[PDB]
Amino acid sequence: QIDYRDVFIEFLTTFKGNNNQNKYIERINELVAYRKKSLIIEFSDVLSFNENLAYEIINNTKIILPILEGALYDHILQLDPTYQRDIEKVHVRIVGIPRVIELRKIRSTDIGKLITIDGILVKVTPVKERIYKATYKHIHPDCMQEFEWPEDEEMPEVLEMPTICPKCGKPGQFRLIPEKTKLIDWQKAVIQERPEEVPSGQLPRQLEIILEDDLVDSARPGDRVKVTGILDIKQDSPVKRGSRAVFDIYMKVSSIEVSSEEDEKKIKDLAKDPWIRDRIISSIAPSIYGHWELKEALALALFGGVPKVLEDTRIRGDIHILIIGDPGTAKSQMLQFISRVAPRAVYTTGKGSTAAGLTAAVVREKGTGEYYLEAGALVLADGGIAVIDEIDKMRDEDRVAIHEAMEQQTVSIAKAGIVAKLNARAAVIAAGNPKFGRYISERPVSDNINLPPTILSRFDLIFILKDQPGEQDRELANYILDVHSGKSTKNIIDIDTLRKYIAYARKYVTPKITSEAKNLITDFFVEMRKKSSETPDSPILITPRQLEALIRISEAYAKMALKAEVTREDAERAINIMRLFLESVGVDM
């Protein structure tokens, strides 16, 4: 009843933020600057400013939402006249609706109301076009008339053509005119409930959501999102007789949330401590005590090196880590920790999940038989980390293709008339059990993990975990039971703060090699080759790949402290960690 348009306008311009800065005006100006056409607002702010306005939004969103958008559009064009002729319709979206419904609990009483759903995206269709105002021509030798059939109404989701020509009042044949037809971007996605909320002995439920206008391509598949909108009954084919008076339901998305400058200031401040490197090492897997060398390697892997892209060649910048632990050594604890702390990670096994084990595969279409490509674990992890538990029982097909993916970081297909090349620039962290149950120290590494020696040369660092029944058993037994009761350490960095720290470093730090670091690395590599040459039965191969590992590892240390250059200290740490790796495999360095 009461015109909230004035109330809405003053609320946007007079919203007391964290410091009465009127942040809504700031984002409105930002919207005009880049022509974003979409303004999001928080339900809490509306309720605090005027609870009566908030109730109207959450109860009569069908009626008052277009009214509010018109008021906002008038304000924007009044503020800036150049916004016209570019955007004819602005969008206002609400977030933080208190009406949260579990996906399995949806019933008929929730149809037509504004609700929010939390779940996981599984499928996303390519962007398409939907008609909301069509133009038709009456093909009747006396008419030759054009009109817009859905008069004074948006074209419904069911494509219907006129039966009587409105201009001539006659039936006949009508032809669509694409050139005078209004279109809107249209995308379809599927949301699946999280496994935590699935009841015992039941399969997870699914829901179809529709993304339109700027909401298209707002979330990659496999992301946890929060979706707000209206539910409605799907009509796949209304002309299909055969009873079936039952229908599915779908969601018209109005706002989607996935999963700051202040963070950057605190991240740079956190890097001011000269002992930041050791603090990061301590913060890695705080649950597990000891294993400092293994912890140090994992920190370097997350940061990684700087890849080099040249005119004729590309040089890998990722770091690969192999762990061979005895059963019961709890090798899966920090692996789960790595997945959580990594900004982007993929968890899988040796056999993979789909037909494409790790690299890729070519699959005939089920309906038409056409050949297409399915991405493997390595491809899906591009730009991030690929954690592969149980590396020793990969598919036989992948045992050869993994050579190229782990070194050239590409997957090449020349099968069934399809030629393609897929990027696989992903750091690989893998764990495998010894082939003889328990690791044997005297035996080499190749005959202990059941992998070709060529693969071993592709791993920057290899570590062996042995369940030694020493004095630590009592402490380990106490430690295991303490984890059962619950305990934590002190003076660490939480995963949430650490995750953004790693992400910031990987996006803005590209260390460069200095002359002093260059000389130190050169001498060690020459020393490395001499030692391996003397022993005619070296358990490991010392190839030029090892020299690349020294460069990559040293860069990660500089990146760990957000250093612009690589100095002697970074190089010295890189040499020392490689020295321990050679001792672990049994090489007298």
Which residues contribute to the annotated binding site for ATP?
A: 325-332
- Residue 366 is a binding residue for DNA (CB under 7 A): yes
Residues 223-242 that bind its own copies (CB under 8 A): 232-233, 235-242
Please answer whether residues 566 and 512 qualify as being in contact, where contact means their C-beta atoms are separated by less than 8 angstroms: yes
Please answer whether residues 22 and 15 qualify as being in contact, where contact means their C-beta atoms are separated by less than 8 angstroms: yes
20 binds, among Mg ion, Zn ion, its own copies, none (CB under 5 to 8 A by kind): none
- Residue 174 is a binding residue for Zn ion (CB under 5 A): no
Phi-psi region of 508 (alpha: psi -120 to 50; beta: other; left: phi over 0): alpha
333 binds, among DNA, its own copies, Mg ion, none (CB under 5 to 8 A by kind): its own copies
Tokens of 367: 């309906």
Task: Compute the 3-state secondary structure of the chain and give helix, strand, coil in percent, each to the nearest 5.
Answer: 40, 25, 40
Measured from the CB atom, the residue of 99 and 415 that comes closer to DNA is 415
478 binds, among DNA, Zn ion, its own copies, none (CB under 5 to 8 A by kind): its own copies
- Residue 202 is a binding residue for its own copies (CB under 8 A): yes
Residues 82-111 that bind its own copies (CB under 8 A): 104, 106-108, 111
Per-residue binding string, Mg ion, 324-353, x by CB under 5 A, is -------xx---------------------
Q: Which residues pair with residue 100 across a beta bridge? A: 116
**Residue type (1 letter), 534:** E
Residues 437-476 that bind Mg ion (CB under 5 A): none
Measured from the CB atom, the residue of 20 and 109 that comes closer to its own copies is 109
- Residue 160 is a binding residue for its own copies (CB under 8 A): yes
Shortest CB 366 distance to its own copies, Å = 4
Measured from the CB atom, the residue of 125 and 173 that comes closer to Zn ion is 173
Residues 479-518 that bind its own copies (CB under 8 A): 480-481, 483-486, 488, 494-495, 512-513, 518
Sign of CA dihedral 306, 309, 315, 319: positive
Tokens of 502: 């790693």
HEC-encoded secondary structure of 108-150: HHHCCCEEEEEEEEEEECCCEEEEEECCEEEECCCCCCEECCC
116 binds, among DNA, Zn ion, its own copies, none (CB under 5 to 8 A by kind): none
Shortest CB 332 distance to Mg ion, Å = 3
Per-residue binding string, DNA, 409-448, x by CB under 7 A, is ------xx--------------------------------
Helix (H, G, I), strand (E, B) or coil at 573: helix
Count of chain residues binding its own copies (CB under 8 A)? 186
**Residue type (1 letter), 585:** V
Sign of CA dihedral 60, 61, 63, 69: positive
Q: What burial letters (b/e) apply to 198-233, b meaning 16+ CB within 10 Å?
A: eeeeeebbebebbbbeebbebbeeeeebbbbbbbee
- Residue 290 is a binding residue for its own copies (CB under 8 A): no
Q: Which residues pair with residue 138 across a beta bridge? A: 174
292, containing H or E segment: helix 292-303
List the one residue from 41, 360, 387, 553 that touches DNA (CB under 7 A). Answer: 360
Helix (H, G, I), strand (E, B) or coil at 381: coil
Measured from the CB atom, the residue of 33 and 309 that comes closer to its own copies is 309
Residues 111-170 that bind Zn ion (CB under 5 A): 138, 143, 165, 167-168
Sign of CA dihedral 102, 106, 110, 114: positive
Binding site for DNA (CB under 7 A): 354-357, 360-364, 366, 415-416
Binding site for Mg ion (CB under 5 A): 331-332
